[PDB]
Amino acid sequence: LVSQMDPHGRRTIFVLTKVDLAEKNVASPSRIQQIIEGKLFPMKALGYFAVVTGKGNSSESIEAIREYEEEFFQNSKLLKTSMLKAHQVTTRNLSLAVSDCFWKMVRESVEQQADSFKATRFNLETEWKNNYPRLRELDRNELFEKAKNEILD
Amino acid sequence: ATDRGSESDKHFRKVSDKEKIDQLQEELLHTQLKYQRILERLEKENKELRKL
């Protein structure tokens, strides 16, 4: 689905999860590394990341999970065999990459679309005034009340 | 106002102003701002005639 929605990885960030579980249950290189390298799937990315989500327990705290993340990425296969990039693992690196890419994309796209939304409100004015020059922003409930008064009259 | 030449001119002016602030022009300005610095700052050194 990611490859369908972003064939070129223009704003795609990839993350693996359950890395601490993956230490004893690592996804085999022959399928996971081809995903990290964008070869098994057309999905390209701004970077291939990984974070730990716990050991399957639902009550785990934020700090615990982050600690387990640090232990895993210090000791485990995701880095020692060079699938994922060291600067692209752990919660903080993923969060910072997402924030930076997000807010740059925001500064570039929101100004254009905000000028376009000024245009959008004038565009709604264009059609609306032609449709109802005499009456503006009329609602069906208001119309019902008016009809009720007229009918009782 | 309908079928009036001056009104048509004013409408054209508005339409052309919106095109003047089009995303093509806006991206041109944004890229031009970096280009004014890229391959630049050589000029101030160039003005010296000592090499000449």
User: Which letter does DSSP use for residue A59 in this model?
Assistant: S
Tokens 């508005």 — which residue?
B14
**How far apart are the C-alpha atoms of A131 and A95, rounded to whole Å?**
48
Count of CB pairs separated by less than 8 Å, A with B: 6
**How far apart are the C-alpha atoms of A133 and A124, rounded to whole Å?**
13
Residue A10 exposed, middle or buried by CB count within 10 Å (0-12, 13-18, 19+): exposed
How many Cα atoms sit within 13 Å of B41 on the Cβ side?
Answer: 4
Nearest 5 degrees, angle CA A53-CA A50-CA A36? 135
CA distance B17 to chain A (A): 12
**How far apart are the C-alpha atoms of A121 and A115, rounded to whole Å?**
10
Scanning A61-139, the segments in alpha helix (DSSP H) are 62-75, 77-80, 91-131
- Resolution in angstrom units: 9.7
Structure tokens at A106: 């925001």
User: Hey, which residues 2-41 in chain B have their CB within 8 Å of chain A?
Assistant: 18, 21, 23, 26
User: Which letter does DSSP use for residue A53 in this model?
Assistant: -
Chain B partners of A104 at a C-beta cutoff of 8 Å? none
Give the type of residue at B8: S
A20 is in an annotated binding site: yes
